[PDB]
Design a protein around this ligand. Structure first.
Ligand code: M6S
Ligand code: NAG
Ligand code: NA
Ligand code: NA
Lengths: 249, 27, 10
């Protein structure tokens, strides 16, 4: 996260760290959607241009974390993966269209003050909140700058940007399965997700029922926090039918 | 269920430092 | 720079 702030304790209890066993490193962000399911970006797990193709035993999910590097004894919970499910129409060749994946945990995670699932939106939630100017919140342990690393979880609030403005900022083809967010050069305010924040959640707090909803997944960008550029997010509601199908089994 | 309600915030009726910024943007 | 995690997590 570039130009964000340290998260407060328990601020994002659905935040998950995807952790590579060997070498021991941060793989990606992710989110807790139930006691057994974790949501992430498909590119965190499968990305042939960079020879990325992780299997279940290559990683661990670390839930309830704040500090990036420390083993948070009696707070964080480390879970193993039973199975990874990548969207069958994930487009890694061109624009990361349908950049979404599910991970089933071997055992259910126990909820605590630091571990709690986020909601997934329904059609009405998405229609009411996914509006240009409406702000969401992005969290992660990724890069503080495009070109170090935070000590603790970072947070940034960013406005959803008009589809034409998103389209006009890039040469990449934008799909209906994506949305973009961030401030304009004329807005003064800054902020963006960056490398290592991938797979993390873009959340919004419904003013109707006061619950947090995951509207997006950190997907891609061209650099980090560049003027006239925006972060791109997987549109969670647009892919909910796939989510439900996988969970229903 | 209890999805999206934080034990240290919504469950205690405590607000985090920037959630008002999100609410103010929902015009 | 990651602190070692307990052996029980493989
Ligand atoms: C800094 N990295 C890049 O610019 C690579 N840029 C590529 C990219 O972002 N990719 C391929 C896999 C994924 C990735 O690296 N995600 C990490 C990331 C997350 C958020 C943001 C952001 N909101 N600024 C930037 C990067 C991007 C280049 C244009 C075509 C789509 C893929
Ligand atoms: C990824 O890894 C699996 C082995 O787990 C292999 O079957 C598969 O074809 C590899 N490549 C892609 C592009 O999925
Ligand atoms: Na364009
Ligand atoms: Na920008």
């Amino acid at each position: 996260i570039v130009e964000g702030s340290d998260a407060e304790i328990g601020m994002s209890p659905w935040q998950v760290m995807l952790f590579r066993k060997s070498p021991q490193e941060l793989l990606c962000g992710a989110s807790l959607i139930s006691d057994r399911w974790v949501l992430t970006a498909a590119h965190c797990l499968l990305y042939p241009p960079w020879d990325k193709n992780f299997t279940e035993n290559d990683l661990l999910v670390r839930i309830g974390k704040h500090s990036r590097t420390r083993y948070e004894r009696n707070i964080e919970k480390i879970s193993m993966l039973e199975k990874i499910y990548i969207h069958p129409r994930y487009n890694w060749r061109e624009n990361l269209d349908r950049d979404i994946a599910l991970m089933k945990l071997k055992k259910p995670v126990a909820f605590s003050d630091y571990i709690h699932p986020v909601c997934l939106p329904d059609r009405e939630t998405a229609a009411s909140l996914l509006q240009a100017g409406y702000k969401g919140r992005v969290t992660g342990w990724g890069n503080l700058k495009e070109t170090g690393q935070p000590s603790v979880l970072q947070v940034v609030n960013l406005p959803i940007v008009e589809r034409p403005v998103c389209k006009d900022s890039t040469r990449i083809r934008i799909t209906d399965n994506m949305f973009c967010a961030g401030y304009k050069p004329d807005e003064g305010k800054r902020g963006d997700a960056c490398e290592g924040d991938s797979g993390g959640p873009f959340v919004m707090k419904s003013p109707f029922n006061n619950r947090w909803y995951q509207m997006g997944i950190v997907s891609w960008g061209e650099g980090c926090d560049r003027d006239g550029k925006y972060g791109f997010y997987t549109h969670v509601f647009r892919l909910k039918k796939w989510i439900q199908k996988v969970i229903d089994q | 269920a209890d999805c999206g309600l934080r034990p240290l915030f919504e469950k205690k009726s405590l607000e985090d430092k920037t959630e008002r910024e999100l609410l103010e943007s929902y015009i | 720079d990651f602190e070692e995690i307990p052996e029980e997590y493989l």
